[PDB]
Nucleic acid binder design. Structure first.
Ligand SMILES: [K+]
Ligand SMILES: [Mg+2]
Ligand SMILES: [Mg+2]
Ligand SMILES: [Mg+2]
Ligand SMILES: [Mg+2]
Ligand SMILES: [Mg+2]
Ligand SMILES: [Mg+2]
Ligand SMILES: [Mg+2]
Ligand SMILES: [Mg+2]
Ligand SMILES: [Mg+2]
Ligand SMILES: [Mg+2]
Ligand SMILES: [Mg+2]
Ligand SMILES: [Mg+2]
Ligand SMILES: [Mg+2]
Ligand SMILES: [Mg+2]
Ligand SMILES: [Mg+2]
Ligand SMILES: [Mg+2]
Ligand SMILES: [Mg+2]
Ligand SMILES: [Mg+2]
Ligand SMILES: [Mg+2]
Ligand SMILES: [Mg+2]
Ligand SMILES: [Mg+2]
Ligand SMILES: [Mg+2]
Ligand SMILES: [Mg+2]
Ligand SMILES: [Mg+2]
Ligand SMILES: [Mg+2]
Ligand SMILES: [Mg+2]
Ligand SMILES: [Mg+2]
Ligand SMILES: [Mg+2]
Ligand SMILES: [Mg+2]
Ligand SMILES: [Mg+2]
Ligand SMILES: [Mg+2]
Lengths: 60, 137, 208, 86, 74, 117
RNA sequence: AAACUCCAGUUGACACAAAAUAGACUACGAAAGUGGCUUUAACAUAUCUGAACACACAAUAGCUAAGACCCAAACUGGGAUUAGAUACCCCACUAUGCUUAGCCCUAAACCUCAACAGUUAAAUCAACAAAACUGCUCGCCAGAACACUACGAGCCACAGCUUAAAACUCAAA
């Protein structure tokens, strides 16, 4: 099951302690809602040129 | 049907049979190939010991144990004692990267047992106990 | 060697050159055509085209030779063959009709089989690893197996245990025991096999 | 210890050809890097030594992949001489 | 090497000289030793290709400058 | 795809700590490593083990172990012939990848130039 | 060899320890450091440089007090090697590595390559390394050894750290 809710920051810590004492909860994790974060638009993939001038042009 | 290298799922229904026994009921032959010794134990689906053999129990001691031929000798002996109790098909679960990793499996084949599945269960910690220090060889 | 590398070993085989041309294959015909343009070494005195020639016996005779004394070396060989045949003939006449069927009286068949029974199937090679020498079992080449059979037979005959016993008597006595899977030479093969089997866990040391 | 058994790193033997199945299992472990991980885990590799080994391998990979690319790039020139005698 | 045959024929037709082969060291700077004390060096060198077969400047380009021989190069 | 080399090495422009510390310059050479001979391994151990197993059961009598003896003897013949063929015919046959001797001739036709000409 | 045999193998239960793969990524932080997951707080400066009389930090090792016990492991003990082996190899185990609080203030703390703003043109440039330079400011350096030393001074440091000489000696380093 998924529970979506609006709570203050201090309410997150208290809820985690509550879920641990519940014997009917197999596992309970509180995370940020992924829809709140806005995915920045991606232009694409820019090719990476081969690194140059890494060594001197002296005749070894 | 095309052969699938992936083992059948115990929950699912599969048509593959080996002498009328499903994949989950096949006895298991666990192999522990250490750097110095090879221990082979054959157990059934209900975790009932059937046959056990090792290089130390088959006329090899000290450095002689850490050899492929010693593991092969143990594999033949392990098959012989398992074959007495009615074992025909085995599932191989090899643990370790020792010299007897494959030779011990050969002894089972030449001893009258059939290999249907191979599984590697080498313990790899995901970060775990800090191993011993490097040798100054 | 005074022979130039262009020289080729002569082939001493009467039936080889009497084979009809039709039976020859294309490659076999090419070999015959090629040899007409190749220099051929002179035939050694030891090898001949006689039907009585036995390569094993001549090889054994050479190994018995001391200081180039082939006349004495061959004399000991022929006396041994005569002694074996005479000993079998005495046993044949002293045996019943049923026993006479299984008695072998051919000296060559006894000699060839006796050497075969002494050939070791595996050998030992001392391998230097970890500052120590281990007798690692190895497979033996076909030439090495036959050479060991002859050398073992000769060494036992030359042993100091035998007192005032002529070589034809010692050699004939050991050949019969080898032909019957008995004697020290056969025991030598078993001892080599036992050591090789006992050190079978060291067979991984060899790198070939 | 808490996952389902006979699923991970399991190869089914086809028609009794155990040799092919074991090589397939060995190759899968090698490709995923399990084989190399186990060997380095036999004796502890200190963090200073691990970084030096990783840097060597990363530099080795760059040179190996660059040299391989040039060999494939120039492989088309491995033909016979088109101007023999000149 | 592709145009080596053409250049040699062109030089013969116009009564001039061509060197389309491997350039042995010292053909210009050490010419008095390779040929003789009275050899005459070229008064003009023309490069139809100024690069060798390893994509580097031809040795004669540097050598001709040393021997104050003008060069015309493509 | 080749891993990027931008910012990996410690340089004047690079503000961050180095990523790679190569003991040699990262410049393609004109030669490749020569082919490494395969490490020798013991052969016909299985056949030898089978042949020696019967000797223990039959008190080292060859008459009762003729079949197993021939099996090991045949294996040695195959191993010897294959080893000679692999060392001679396969090496000369140039099977698989191009030989380093021929590969180096191609590489020196297009040498790497880390300098300015 | 010693050790273990109250052991080993399969199965189940089962951390105050350590964080495969991703990572062929090259990000964050002043540096030291930082690579399992979640949440909270949070990542200085609208010109730059600037305190080795100042303040706040500083891997690892170590001290102090109370705990945690898997593994690894100074010292130590045993086994072996060796002319001897107070080492390299093997085994067992402690300090220690972890947590809390307070110390200690060192490193090849090195990317041995200062901060900011620029340039790729001339003479580019001893060598090697990781091309050569401009403007400005701060820190630092003036033969080797004595010397990461003596003395003085400061410090929760007391077998310590920081600052740091001299005489004699050499014509090299
Ligand atoms: K992890
Ligand atoms: Mg767990
Ligand atoms: Mg940064
Ligand atoms: Mg270096
Ligand atoms: Mg290589
Ligand atoms: Mg003991
Ligand atoms: Mg367990
Ligand atoms: Mg931790
Ligand atoms: Mg951590
Ligand atoms: Mg990694
Ligand atoms: Mg986190
Ligand atoms: Mg977080
Ligand atoms: Mg900031
Ligand atoms: Mg400031
Ligand atoms: Mg600290
Ligand atoms: Mg501490
Ligand atoms: Mg104290
Ligand atoms: Mg304490
Ligand atoms: Mg421990
Ligand atoms: Mg102690
Ligand atoms: Mg001691
Ligand atoms: Mg402890
Ligand atoms: Mg550091
Ligand atoms: Mg510094
Ligand atoms: Mg500054
Ligand atoms: Mg700048
Ligand atoms: Mg220069
Ligand atoms: Mg100090
Ligand atoms: Mg001091
Ligand atoms: Mg003073
Ligand atoms: Mg003082
Ligand atoms: Mg300081």
């Amino acid at each position: 099951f998924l529970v979506d809710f609006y709570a203050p920051t201090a309410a997150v810590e208290s809820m985690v302690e509550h879920l641990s004492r519940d014997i009917d909860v197999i596992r309970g994790n509180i995370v940020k809602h992924p829809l709140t974060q806005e995915l920045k638009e991606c232009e694409g993939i820019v090719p990476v040129p081969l690194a140059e001038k890494l060594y001197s042009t002296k005749k070894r | 049907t095309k052969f699938s290298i992936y083992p059948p799922i115990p929950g699912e229904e599969s048509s593959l049979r080996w002498a009328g026994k499903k994949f989950e009921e096949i006895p298991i032959a666990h192999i522990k190939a250490s750097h110095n010794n090879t221990q082979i134990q054959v157990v059934s689906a209900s975790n009932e010991p059937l046959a056990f053999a090792s290089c130390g129990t088959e006329g090899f001691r000290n450095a002689k144990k850490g050899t492929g031929i010693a593991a092969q000798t143990a594999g033949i002996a392990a098959a012989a004692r398992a074959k007495q109790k009615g074992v025909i098909h085995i599932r191989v679960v090899v643990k370790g990267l020792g010299p007897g990793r494959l030779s011990a499996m050969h002894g089972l084949i030449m001893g009258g047992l059939e290999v249907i599945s191979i599984t590697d269960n080498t313990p790899i910690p995901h970060x775990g106990c800090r191993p011993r220090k490097a040798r100054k060889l | 060697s005074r022979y130039s590398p262009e020289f080729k070993d002569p082939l001493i085989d009467k039936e080889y050159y009497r084979k009809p041309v039709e039976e020859l294959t294309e490659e076999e015909k090419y070999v015959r055509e090629l040899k007409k343009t190749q220099l051929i070494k002179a035939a050694p005195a030891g090898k001949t085209s006689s039907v009585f020639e036995d390569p094993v016996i001549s090889k054994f005779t050479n190994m018995m030779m001391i200081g180039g004394n082939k006349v004495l070396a061959r004399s000991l060989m022929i006396q041994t063959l005569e002694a074996v045949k005479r000993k079998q003939f005495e046993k044949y006449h002293a045996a019943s009709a049923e026993e006479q069927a299984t008695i072998e009286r051919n000296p060559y068949t006894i000699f060839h089989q006796a050497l075969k029974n002494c050939e070791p199937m595996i050998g030992l090679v001392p391998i230097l690893k970890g500052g120590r020498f281990y007798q690692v079992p190895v497979p033996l080449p076909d030439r090495r197996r036959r050479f060991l059979a002859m050398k073992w037979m000769i060494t036992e005959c030359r042993d100091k245990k035998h007192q005032r016993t002529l070589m034809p008597e010692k050699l004939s006595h050991k050949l019969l025991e080898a032909f019957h899977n008995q004697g020290p030479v056969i025991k030598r093969k078993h001892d080599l096999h036992k050591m090789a089997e006992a050190n079978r866990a060291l067979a991984h040391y060899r790198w070939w | 210890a808490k996952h389902l058994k006979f699923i991970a790193r399991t190869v089914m033997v086809q028609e009794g050809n155990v040799e092919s199945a074991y090589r397939t299992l060995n190759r899968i472990l090698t490709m995923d890097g399990l084989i190399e991980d186990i060997k380095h885990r036999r004796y502890y590799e200190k963090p200073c030594r691990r970084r030096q080994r990783e840097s060597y391998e990363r530099c080795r990979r760059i040179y190996n992949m660059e040299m391989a690319r040039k060999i494939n790039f120039l492989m088309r020139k491995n033909r016979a001489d088109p101007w023999q005698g000149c | 090497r592709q145009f080596s045959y053409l250049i040699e024929n062109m030089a013969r037709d116009c009564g001039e000289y061509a060197h389309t082969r491997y350039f042995r060291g010292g053909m210009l700077t050490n010419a008095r030793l390779l040929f003789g004390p009275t050899v005459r060096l070229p008064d003009l060198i023309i490069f139809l290709h100024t690069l060798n077969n390893i994509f580097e400047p031809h040795v004669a380009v540097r050598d001709a400058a040393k021997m104050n021989i003008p060069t015309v190069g493509i | 795809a080749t891993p990027s080399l931008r910012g990996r090495l410690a340089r004047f422009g690079n503000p961050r700590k180095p990523v790679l510390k190569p003991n040699k310059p990262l410049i393609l050479a004109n030669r490749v490593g020569e082919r490494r001979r395969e490490k020798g391994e013991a052969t016909c151990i299985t056949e030898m083990s089978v042949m020696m197993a019967c000797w223990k059961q039959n008190e080292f009598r060859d008459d009762a172990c003729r079949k197993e003896i021939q099996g090991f003897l045949d294996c040695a013949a195959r191993a010897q012939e294959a080893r000679k063929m692999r060392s001679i015919q396969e090496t000369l046959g140039e099977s698989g990848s191009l030989l380093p001797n021929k590969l180096n001739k191609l590489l020196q036709r297009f040498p790497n130039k880390p300098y300015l000409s």
